């Protein structure tokens, strides 16, 4: 409808796949080469389904900060025959607050879904499903089961992936440029 949705659509159309694990279907953001991200609670194993194709996992790393606190991001390297468009230059370098964000989801259950979530707070610490978690972004939208892995964007920036909610608020794990240096 406007330039926020324009940027979100551009990311969804080229840089997302549908990931299936034993824990469900997730929106999965491809970042560069064969490297993607998913919420750690997806419990990635040795094999994952990518757009319903059986795919070997070459590496999977559940990220934690230097206090050894959960970040709820898993970085996955996929044995896939095709590279993602490199979008690392759209990742923020530092922790921040944002205005006018969009949460975008693409699954069998929620195809081509775009939610204007509005203002995003650098919330920080969250007890997420009983797990102490850092670098959480919060938005005041009643997000629901099926949105985990959804991409949080502003115009020109890919800032997080949706990891939970409390019925009234939704929570995303930050994406930082420093996670994907090589």
Ligand X SMILES: CCS(=O)(=O)NCc1ccc2c(c1)OCO2
Active-site amino acid positions: 41, 72, 148
Q: Does 132 bind ligand X (CB under 6 A)?
A: no
- Say how far apart CA 22 and CA 7 lie, in whole Å: 31
Cα distances (angstroms) measured from residue 10 to each of 7, 19, 43, 45, 176: 5, 19, 28, 29, 20
Q: Does 149 bind ligand X (CB under 6 A)?
A: no
User: Both tokens of residue 138?
Assistant: 């919060």
Lay out the site mask for ligand X across 99-128 (x = CB under 6 A, - = otherwise): -----------------------------x
Q: Does 129 bind ligand X (CB under 6 A)?
A: yes
The long-range contacts involving 54-60, CB below 8 angstroms and separated by at least 24 positions, are 55/79, 55/80, 58/34
Shortest approach of ligand X to residue 50 CB, angstroms?
21
Q: Does 134 bind ligand X (CB under 6 A)?
A: no
Q: Does 131 bind ligand X (CB under 6 A)?
A: yes
Binding segment for ligand X (CB under 6 A), chosen from 30-38, 83-91, 114-122, 160-168, is: 160-168
- Residue 76 parent element (H or E): strand 70-78
- Residue 36 parent element (H or E): strand 35-39
**β-pairing verdict for 157-165 and 113-128:** unpaired
Q: Does 72 bind ligand X (CB under 6 A)?
A: yes
Q: Does 170 bind ligand X (CB under 6 A)?
A: no
Shortest approach of ligand X to residue 129 CB, angstroms?
3
Interface residue list for ligand X (CB under 6 A): 41, 72, 128-129, 131, 148, 163-165
């Amino acid at each position: 409808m406007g330039p926020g949705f324009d940027f979100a659509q551009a990311i969804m159309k080229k840089n997302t796949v549908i990931a299936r694990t034993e824990k469900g279907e997730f929106t999965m953001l491809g970042v560069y080469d064969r490297v993607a991200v998913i919420p750690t609670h997806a419990s990635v194993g040795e094999i994952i389904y990518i757009n319903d194709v059986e795919t070997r996992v070459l590496d999977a790393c559940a990220l934690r900060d230097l206090t050894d606190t959960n970040l709820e991001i898993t970085i996955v390297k996929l044995d896939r025959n095709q590279k993602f468009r490199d979008i690392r230059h759209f990742l923020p370098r530092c922790e921040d607050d944002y205005n006018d964000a969009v949460l975008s989801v693409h699954t069998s259950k929620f195809p081509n879904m775009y939610i204007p979530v509005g203002q995003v707070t650098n919330y920080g610490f969250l007890n997420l499903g009983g797990t102490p978690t850092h670098r959480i972004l919060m938005y005041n939208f009643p997000t629901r089961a099926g949105q985990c892995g959804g991409v949080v964007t502003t115009t020109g920036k890919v800032i997080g992936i949706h990891v939970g909610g409390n019925g009234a608020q939704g929570f995303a794990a930050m994406l930082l440029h420093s996670y994907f240096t090589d």
